Amino acid sequence: SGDNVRSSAGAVRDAGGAFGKREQAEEERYFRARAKE
Amino acid sequence: TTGRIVAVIGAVVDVQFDEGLPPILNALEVQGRETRLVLEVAQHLGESTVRTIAMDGTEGLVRGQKVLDSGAPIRIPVGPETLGRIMNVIGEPIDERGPIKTKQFAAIHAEAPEFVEMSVEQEILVTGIKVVDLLAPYAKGGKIGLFGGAGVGKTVLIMELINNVAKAHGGYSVFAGVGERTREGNDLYHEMIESGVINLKDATSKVALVYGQMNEPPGARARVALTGLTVAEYFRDQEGQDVLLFIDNIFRFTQAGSEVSALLGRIPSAVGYQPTLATDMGTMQERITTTKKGSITSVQAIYVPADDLTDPAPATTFAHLDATTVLSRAIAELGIYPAVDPLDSTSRIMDPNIVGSEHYDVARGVQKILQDYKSLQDIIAILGMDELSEEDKLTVSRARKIQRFLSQPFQVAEVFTGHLGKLVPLKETIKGFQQILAGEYDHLPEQAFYMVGPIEEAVAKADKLAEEH
Amino acid sequence: TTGRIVAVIGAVVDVQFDEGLPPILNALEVQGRETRLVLEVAQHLGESTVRTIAMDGTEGLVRGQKVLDSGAPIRIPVGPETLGRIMNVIGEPIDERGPIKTKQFAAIHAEAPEFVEMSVEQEILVTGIKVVDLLAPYAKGGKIGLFGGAGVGKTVLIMELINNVAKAHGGYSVFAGVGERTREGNDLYHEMIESGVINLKDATSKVALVYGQMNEPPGARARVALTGLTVAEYFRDQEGQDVLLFIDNIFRFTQAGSEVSALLGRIPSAVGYQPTLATDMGTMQERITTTKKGSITSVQAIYVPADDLTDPAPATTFAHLDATTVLSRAIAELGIYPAVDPLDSTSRIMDPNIVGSEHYDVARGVQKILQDYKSLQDIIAILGMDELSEEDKLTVSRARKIQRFLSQPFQVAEVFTGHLGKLVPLKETIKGFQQILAGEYDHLPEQAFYMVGPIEEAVAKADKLA
Amino acid sequence: TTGRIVAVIGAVVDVQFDEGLPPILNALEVQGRETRLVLEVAQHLGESTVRTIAMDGTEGLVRGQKVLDSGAPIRIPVGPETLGRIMNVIGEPIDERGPIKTKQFAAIHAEAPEFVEMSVEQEILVTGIKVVDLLAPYAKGGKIGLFGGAGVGKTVLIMELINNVAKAHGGYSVFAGVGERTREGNDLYHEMIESGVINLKDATSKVALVYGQMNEPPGARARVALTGLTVAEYFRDQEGQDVLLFIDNIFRFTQAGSEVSALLGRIPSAVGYQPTLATDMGTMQERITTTKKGSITSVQAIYVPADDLTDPAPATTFAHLDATTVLSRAIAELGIYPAVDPLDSTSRIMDPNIVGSEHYDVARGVQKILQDYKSLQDIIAILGMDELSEEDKLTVSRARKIQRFLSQPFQVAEVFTGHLGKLVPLKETIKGFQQILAGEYDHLPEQAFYMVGPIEEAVAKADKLA
Amino acid sequence: ATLKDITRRLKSIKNIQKITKSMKMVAAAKLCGAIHSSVAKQTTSEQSARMTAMDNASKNASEMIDKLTLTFNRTRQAVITKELIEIISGAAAL
Amino acid sequence: KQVAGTMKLELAQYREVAAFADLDAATQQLLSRGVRLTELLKQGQYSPMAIEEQVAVIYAGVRGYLDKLEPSKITKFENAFLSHVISQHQALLGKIRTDGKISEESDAKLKEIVTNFLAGFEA
Numbered sequence A: 001s002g003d004n005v006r007s008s009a010g011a012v013r014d015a016g017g018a019f020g021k022r023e024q025a026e027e028e029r030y031f032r033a034r035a036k037e
Numbered sequence B: 001t002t003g004r005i006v007a008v009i010g011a012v013v014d015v016q017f018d019e020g021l022p023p024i025l026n027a028l029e030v031q032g033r034e035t036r037l038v039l040e041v042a043q044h045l046g047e048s049t050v051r052t053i054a055m056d057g058t059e060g061l062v063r064g065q066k067v068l069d070s071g072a073p074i075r076i077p078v079g080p081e082t083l084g085r086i087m088n089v090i091g092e093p094i095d096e097r098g099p100i101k102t103k104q105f106a107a108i109h110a111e112a113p114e115f116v117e118m119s120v121e122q123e124i125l126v127t128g129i130k131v132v133d134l135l136a137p138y139a140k141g142g143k144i145g146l147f148g149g150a151g152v153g154k155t156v157l158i159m160e161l162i163n164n165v166a167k168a169h170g171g172y173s174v175f176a177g178v179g180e181r182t183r184e185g186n187d188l189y190h191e192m193i194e195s196g197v198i199n200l201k202d203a204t205s206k207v208a209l210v211y212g213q214m215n216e217p218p219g220a221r222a223r224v225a226l227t228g229l230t231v232a233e234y235f236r237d238q239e240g241q242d243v244l245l246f247i248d249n250i251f252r253f254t255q256a257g258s259e260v261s262a263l264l265g266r267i268p269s270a271v272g273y274q275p276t277l278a279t280d281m282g283t284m285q286e287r288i289t290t291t292k293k294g295s296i297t298s299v300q301a302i303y304v305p306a307d308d309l310t311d312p313a314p315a316t317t318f319a320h321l322d323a324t325t326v327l328s329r330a331i332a333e334l335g336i337y338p339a340v341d342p343l344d345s346t347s348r349i350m351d352p353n354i355v356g357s358e359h360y361d362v363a364r365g366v367q368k369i370l371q372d373y374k375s376l377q378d379i380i381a382i383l384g385m386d387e388l389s390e391e392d393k394l395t396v397s398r399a400r401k402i403q404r405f406l407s408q409p410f411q412v413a414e415v416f417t418g419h420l421g422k423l424v425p426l427k428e429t430i431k432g433f434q435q436i437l438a439g440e441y442d443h444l445p446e447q448a449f450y451m452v453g454p455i456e457e458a459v460a461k462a463d464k465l466a467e468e469h
Numbered sequence C, D: 001t002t003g004r005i006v007a008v009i010g011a012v013v014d015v016q017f018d019e020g021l022p023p024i025l026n027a028l029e030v031q032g033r034e035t036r037l038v039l040e041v042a043q044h045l046g047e048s049t050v051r052t053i054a055m056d057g058t059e060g061l062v063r064g065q066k067v068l069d070s071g072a073p074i075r076i077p078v079g080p081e082t083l084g085r086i087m088n089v090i091g092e093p094i095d096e097r098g099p100i101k102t103k104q105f106a107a108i109h110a111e112a113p114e115f116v117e118m119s120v121e122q123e124i125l126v127t128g129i130k131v132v133d134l135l136a137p138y139a140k141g142g143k144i145g146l147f148g149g150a151g152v153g154k155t156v157l158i159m160e161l162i163n164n165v166a167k168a169h170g171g172y173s174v175f176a177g178v179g180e181r182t183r184e185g186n187d188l189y190h191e192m193i194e195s196g197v198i199n200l201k202d203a204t205s206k207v208a209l210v211y212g213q214m215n216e217p218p219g220a221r222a223r224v225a226l227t228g229l230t231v232a233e234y235f236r237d238q239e240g241q242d243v244l245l246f247i248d249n250i251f252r253f254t255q256a257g258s259e260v261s262a263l264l265g266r267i268p269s270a271v272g273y274q275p276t277l278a279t280d281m282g283t284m285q286e287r288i289t290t291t292k293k294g295s296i297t298s299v300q301a302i303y304v305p306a307d308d309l310t311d312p313a314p315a316t317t318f319a320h321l322d323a324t325t326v327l328s329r330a331i332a333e334l335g336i337y338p339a340v341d342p343l344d345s346t347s348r349i350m351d352p353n354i355v356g357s358e359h360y361d362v363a364r365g366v367q368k369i370l371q372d373y374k375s376l377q378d379i380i381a382i383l384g385m386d387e388l389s390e391e392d393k394l395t396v397s398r399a400r401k402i403q404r405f406l407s408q409p410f411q412v413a414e415v416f417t418g419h420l421g422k423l424v425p426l427k428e429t430i431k432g433f434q435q436i437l438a439g440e441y442d443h444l445p446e447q448a449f450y451m452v453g454p455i456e457e458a459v460a461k462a463d464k465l466a
Numbered sequence E: 001a002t003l004k005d006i007t008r009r010l011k012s013i014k015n016i017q018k019i020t021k022s023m024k025m026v027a028a029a030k031l032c033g034a035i036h037s038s039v040a041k042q043t044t045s046e047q048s049a050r051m052t053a054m055d056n057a058s059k060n061a062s063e064m065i066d067k068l069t070l071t072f073n074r075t076r077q078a079v080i081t082k083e084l085i086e087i088i089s090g091a092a093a094l
Numbered sequence F: 001k002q003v004a005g006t007m008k009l010e011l012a013q014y015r016e017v018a019a020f021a022d023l024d025a026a027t028q029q030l031l032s033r034g035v036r037l038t039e040l041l042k043q044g045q046y047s048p049m050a051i052e053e054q055v056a057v058i059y060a061g062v063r064g065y066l067d068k069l070e071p072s073k074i075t076k077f078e079n080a081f082l083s084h085v086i087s088q089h090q091a092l093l094g095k096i097r098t099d100g101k102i103s104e105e106s107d108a109k110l111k112e113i114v115t116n117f118l119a120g121f122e123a
Ligand SMILES: Nc1ncnc2c1ncn2[C@@H]1O[C@H](COP(=O)(O)OP(=O)(O)NP(=O)(O)O)[C@@H](O)[C@H]1O
Pocket: B148, B149, B150, B151, B152, B153, B154, B155, B156, B157, B303, B337, B338, B410, B413, B416, B417
């Protein structure tokens, strides 16, 4: 039962989405910063 | 002694003997055929008639046709001269390279090594696969099980295990094709010929081939597993030498038998499998093991119908393994290879007093953060990435990285990924995950850890990633 | 030669012959009986014994009873004098109007047209039903199947199709009642005599009726379809006319087959059915077809036991259809009639090169917005519609007006809808939807598109609502 | 007549009788064994051969071993001297207190009372236990489903009932341990002795024990419910009493049935149960009703498979129930005893035409106030129990007084509770709660109603505690 | 229907159900329906709405679970029934 | 293989973005190729394309040159375009096949056509 949501569809694509979207910008957000450092 | 065929229904043929009745498990030669046709005595129906499963097609048999009892079970050629040669189910050579002039033949049927014969030694076997060696390490001379639904990576994974461990093996290795694709047999053969693990001009060949693929009637697929096992048996005993045994899909040993059960007159059991499913698998597995005479490092590929691990066939196969690497469509689907499940792959030596405390803690540390991350999969499935305390959303961010760092390019999978297969040393693997769990690389983007070798390339790639932006 | 019954189990009767063994399909007549009792030879058991199937009850039979070999399968009357009459499995009239004096007779068993007799002509058959007309048009000379669960809409639809199509039809029709409600034949019969498609005085009748309702034993219900089928074949071939063949529930033909298969000594297939479900069915459906010699527009009502479309029966029926109209209880329960599934009904005629690109482009517009609304139903049930984008809400809204605009009041159902029947033209249906999609009516309330004919009546009803 | 065992396949045995053949259900005695091995007839295979189900192991049996036809089915000792004693499946005492000296004997297989022997009056069997008698009355001659695992007051409610019914109805009780665990069977025996219901000295025992241990074969475990049934029948047809029959785990009776069925090679019905499910349940359940002479009410503990109420077993069992006593840990924790759920336990007889309009409106009022209070729980905790209108503050209070007044000290608890048990007459309970609902006792503290008997002890307990 | 799938949606919706009920309380203590919706297109309220929203959401999931479980058992019974008939057809074919 | 480069995972990776569809311009882009390529993949029956014709159009999409076009317009465009290459530029296609490869001069002559043709199309 740990991650049943994700082990399906409807709300999974969402969790999948928000997820990737987040870490998507974040990383770019972290990306240029790498340059700074 | 000569017998006559009295009934032919599929792979099941009835032969009646007037003289003497051959004992069960005895091989019978069907006379009058342009290709040796072996019939294995399966039962004694009574009234001097035995029932047998054909080791080939029955297309053409005639009621009354003669059948010569060879006196014993299927005996095949064993010994060093098999190395480099592709063998049949009944010992026939199928490489068109002529006969296999062997000086000894063993019966593919034999008793399993006694209990007093068991070995209790366990030495981790390093494979270069981070996930494997991290979470569920294989062990020297142990029984390795590779589970997986259709096309998730059983065949590619077992291939990597041969390109990694077999090529650098100081000894012989047996490979048995059990009801798979003949095309894969081609691939493996010519690819072993390239790497030089097989030599066609001399005697340096270090792997023996046994095949009985899909195009083959069940009867054959129902015994080849035992054939290949016999060849590796000789290498384990008559030498003691280290032997590696690769069987691509032992599941075809149980389906084979599931395809002839009824015709052997057997009420079907749960899920249609044979009632004898677990014990047939038992008198078959127990034979594939390390004794005090020598050691077998077996790697079996196990199919999982419709992806259901609870299916009788696979669920009965687990206890026969000392290390299991489970593949997951879900994981493969997230483009992570090998598609190994971190939460369902286990190993007997995964003990702190065998791999040390450092190795163990990190492994469980990986598994835990990955289980916690599954718990947040739900919570964030309705809320979004902006509700988790800075503490939780932090682990989510590490889960992703640890998840991605478990993936790894295979030398054998170049043609697929398009990248250069890497090979990771154990220590570099622990360090690798020890540091990520530490929080060190929380400033690096996840993608930096996806498909790489040691933890370094990660930073390096991460850099190549910073400059490109 | 004389045959004798050696065993009786329900509707399977083993008859042993001492001389001259009747071939398979041959129709045997049981002797010593009040009314004609036919047995159909199904197999040769060996030992000069044949296993047959009764076309009527087998009560009263006694082992040793004599059975005669007619020397031919079940032959029924075919020809113009069948029109306006009602006949049973074995062609006997059951309308209390005396013998049916036809010249020719025909075996109810025959081989299907050969591959060289096949027709490839596709030409829509507009029905006045927006959902069918729109998404899965029926084809003249085509095989239309109407799947539906217990009480969902098959009958009413077949009736409407007889109203909107049969009447404006220039030719002969054949209605085959198979395993359904007898009082329905009663209904049909009297509705036809009214409208006049059946005439009991002048010989102008245009409908031939074959019946073997749910009151009949398995052997009958298992062959009635072939009878109605055979009566349709005469009109098609031996007269070269455009023949309409309605069959209310061909599923009964299969169901029946299962009851007897049991008794025939056949190991059962999946779900208890007979092994021969597929073939048995094929050898029949294949005869229900248009050839080069003539046409047959067949409309078959198909029962879905336990509302399970995967059931071997219906499942196996789709491949035999040129057009499918799938009815849904969930849709019916939302009060949408006809409960046609916009996303599970198909037509080989839904091809732009055939119905035009304007028609095809709208059809796909509708199946796209509904499809997209359907994929949102997961979110709507848990987080309501406040969690949907502005874009989403828009489709949801248009889907709901499209769903409702898909309903329609049929004449044959006025009593349950409380609305006067409606017959919508094709262009009017294309138009009505092109508009709802283009957002042209995004200002009208849902309830305005529900149970109406053209789009114009969607607007009228809107004002009334104010 | 003597037979010879010709077939033994597990708990199934086929015996051949050369001359006189023993009818179905007739017990046969195996000859040549230490203990007694009974074989109950089940089928007449033909060829003077009969098939049977053994009531105990079949190891040792040999083909040819002699077997004796006992002339009738399994007969057991019936009458007063069975009370306090623990009887085996076939009638043998297993409490080692020697023989069961009875002058009477009866067959475990007896047709249910005929239609005329039926009671047409719906009377309520007063238990003296408030919740039961007020919210889910036990239909006299009716079956009641006892819901609740273990550690919820089951063994206490069972005996108390034994006590009450004895004190207020003179009828005895029998306990049929169907598929009991030898361990709990032992525990129950002594727990009863130390409770008074059983006396190993003076004939004051109110219950007869009958056991069907799990280690006992499916044949054995299937008949016990009947053995114990036959025992109870004596006290109803012979002493005109209103007996009480306890079947702990009616489920394991059912299951016992399927196993017999399978062993006999019969084809299972849906979900693997026996085809005979309903009849196996019919023949037995129907022997429990009110007869002109007296009546037998039975409390049968029920196990819902996979928590699925629709599973055949229970669903076949719910056809025979008139009430359900639901025990709840949630209730047991709050210290409320008996832990009978006042809202999940129910009765068919809880109808005006049956329990009187008065009694009805009271039970209903209590059910609705609890329902009202159970909802409030949210608001009370979150929105704070400070903004509760007058009508909202009384409900919670009264409900609590009711809820606790639903607790009752059992006479069988005296041994440990150190508190005189109470047996409340139906009259006292109705008025008690009838008033509480009015508000007549709102000027009293909660603990006043907790653990008491008639409403009187509520006020008396209130003053003392001030 | 498939036991594997139903079991997946039940777990998944039982989870959602738990999380939504938890949010209803937090809200109570303190997505908010069509609150942010209205003002944009044009606290007390905010929390009000959030309480309400999760509430309904909580019920809507339970009513969904209640329906999946029935389908669970129906389908659970069916699978057993199927497995058995298969088991016997083979035996009666011997 | 060239233009089909890594469009596949990219498309399947567009699906990852498909669950959303105030998007950030960036991801709005991942969701911008996938919606474009998709239309470019749709096709008519009984009218197969030479592997060279397919590369020509797939090229127009994969090289981002149609990212600022209205999806629903893509299909109408493939038609016009193709009929153009197949008409005026027989030789261009004539190469790509012969060398089954997009050479430098061919990657250029194609960027020349899609971008200008496309614009004349969005006139
Ligand atoms: N390590 C890998 N890297 C990339 N792709 C992989 C990898 N392993 C498997 N695949 C992909 O999955 C495909 C086939 O997997 P394969 O190893 O043959 O599966 P399998 O488990 O043997 N399936 P099967 O035996 O048919 O049930 C390959 O063609 C690849 O596309």
